[PDB]
Amino acid sequence: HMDEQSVESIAEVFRCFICMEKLRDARLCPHCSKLCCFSCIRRWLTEQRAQCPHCRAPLQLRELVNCRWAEEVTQQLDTLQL
Amino acid sequence: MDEQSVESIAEVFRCFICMEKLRDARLCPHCSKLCCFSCIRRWLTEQRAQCPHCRAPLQLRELVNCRWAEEVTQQLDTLQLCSL
Ligand SMILES: [Zn+2]
Ligand SMILES: [Zn+2]
Ligand SMILES: [Zn+2]
Ligand SMILES: [Zn+2]
């Protein structure tokens, strides 16, 4: 149950700041490194305000970083959560 | 716990340049590969100012500070210990 809680601690890092679900098409804020689903952060920047939902820095959709490995890490974490 | 699942994840969180665990992890905005701050800064000074992986123009400032990287590194360590 300790390997279990380590997995869960990692999974928590790779959850969307906005919807707190596991990340789909992860995007990372360049200024603070918080991760969001593409759709979530797109909707935020587009319907809420042009700033990072966590760090509040000005932010346009195109400054967002594609976290290319996120989907693999996320799938692996799924495998681990038996 | 699948050993290779864990190892796959650990590969992601090794420094592309020195292969060790990340120290003050930075991420290349263009390909999102991770490097120790010190390693990538040396690289950019010594080698062409290109990501050692994306090979794309990369300067010190475009570098993303991965604030959660240490946390993950620490947990990975515990996971790897759990070979027992
Ligand atoms: Zn931010
Ligand atoms: Zn989301
Ligand atoms: Zn390094
Ligand atoms: Zn790169």
mmCIF file of N, CA, C and O and ligand atoms in Angstrom, chain B residues 27-33 50-58, ligand 4:
data_model
loop_
_atom_site.group_PDB
_atom_site.id
_atom_site.type_symbol
_atom_site.label_atom_id
_atom_site.label_comp_id
_atom_site.label_asym_id
_atom_site.label_seq_id
_atom_site.Cartn_x
_atom_site.Cartn_y
_atom_site.Cartn_z
ATOM 1 N N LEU B 27 12.369 22.079 -19.053
ATOM 2 C CA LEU B 27 11.751 21.403 -20.169
ATOM 3 C C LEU B 27 11.896 22.245 -21.465
ATOM 4 O O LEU B 27 11.709 23.454 -21.441
ATOM 5 N N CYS B 28 12.257 21.606 -22.575
ATOM 6 C CA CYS B 28 12.306 22.294 -23.864
ATOM 7 C C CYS B 28 10.887 22.486 -24.346
ATOM 8 O O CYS B 28 10.181 21.501 -24.583
ATOM 9 N N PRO B 29 10.480 23.746 -24.528
ATOM 10 C CA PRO B 29 9.166 24.176 -25.033
ATOM 11 C C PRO B 29 8.780 23.531 -26.354
ATOM 12 O O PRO B 29 7.593 23.527 -26.680
ATOM 13 N N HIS B 30 9.746 23.000 -27.100
ATOM 14 C CA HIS B 30 9.471 22.609 -28.476
ATOM 15 C C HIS B 30 9.222 21.120 -28.578
ATOM 16 O O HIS B 30 8.385 20.667 -29.375
ATOM 17 N N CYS B 31 9.944 20.345 -27.777
ATOM 18 C CA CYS B 31 9.709 18.911 -27.779
ATOM 19 C C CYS B 31 9.380 18.384 -26.389
ATOM 20 O O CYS B 31 9.148 17.186 -26.206
ATOM 21 N N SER B 32 9.376 19.285 -25.418
ATOM 22 C CA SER B 32 9.060 18.938 -24.038
ATOM 23 C C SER B 32 9.926 17.804 -23.429
ATOM 24 O O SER B 32 9.482 17.122 -22.507
ATOM 25 N N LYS B 33 11.147 17.602 -23.941
ATOM 26 C CA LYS B 33 12.135 16.774 -23.238
ATOM 27 C C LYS B 33 12.680 17.552 -22.039
ATOM 28 O O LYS B 33 12.851 18.792 -22.105
ATOM 29 N N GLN B 50 20.856 25.049 -29.621
ATOM 30 C CA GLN B 50 19.771 24.218 -30.102
ATOM 31 C C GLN B 50 19.440 23.160 -29.053
ATOM 32 O O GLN B 50 20.333 22.656 -28.369
ATOM 33 N N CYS B 51 18.170 22.811 -28.914
ATOM 34 C CA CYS B 51 17.846 21.756 -27.971
ATOM 35 C C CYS B 51 18.613 20.530 -28.409
ATOM 36 O O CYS B 51 18.611 20.190 -29.580
ATOM 37 N N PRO B 52 19.305 19.883 -27.467
ATOM 38 C CA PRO B 52 20.060 18.656 -27.768
ATOM 39 C C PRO B 52 19.150 17.555 -28.305
ATOM 40 O O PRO B 52 19.666 16.495 -28.630
ATOM 41 N N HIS B 53 17.838 17.798 -28.384
ATOM 42 C CA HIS B 53 16.892 16.827 -28.959
ATOM 43 C C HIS B 53 16.025 17.400 -30.104
ATOM 44 O O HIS B 53 16.049 16.878 -31.213
ATOM 45 N N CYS B 54 15.247 18.449 -29.832
ATOM 46 C CA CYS B 54 14.452 19.102 -30.875
ATOM 47 C C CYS B 54 15.390 19.673 -31.946
ATOM 48 O O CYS B 54 14.973 19.931 -33.076
ATOM 49 N N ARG B 55 16.658 19.858 -31.574
ATOM 50 C CA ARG B 55 17.635 20.577 -32.396
ATOM 51 C C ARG B 55 17.170 21.978 -32.795
ATOM 52 O O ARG B 55 17.813 22.638 -33.613
ATOM 53 N N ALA B 56 16.066 22.431 -32.204
ATOM 54 C CA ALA B 56 15.483 23.714 -32.559
ATOM 55 C C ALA B 56 16.148 24.834 -31.785
ATOM 56 O O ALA B 56 16.728 24.605 -30.728
ATOM 57 N N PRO B 57 16.080 26.058 -32.319
ATOM 58 C CA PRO B 57 16.665 27.170 -31.575
ATOM 59 C C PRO B 57 16.063 27.175 -30.194
ATOM 60 O O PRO B 57 14.845 27.091 -30.063
ATOM 61 N N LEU B 58 16.910 27.259 -29.179
ATOM 62 C CA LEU B 58 16.466 27.254 -27.795
ATOM 63 C C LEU B 58 17.401 28.178 -27.050
ATOM 64 O O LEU B 58 18.622 28.060 -27.176
HETATM 65 ZN ZN ZN C 4 13.497 20.278 -27.608
#
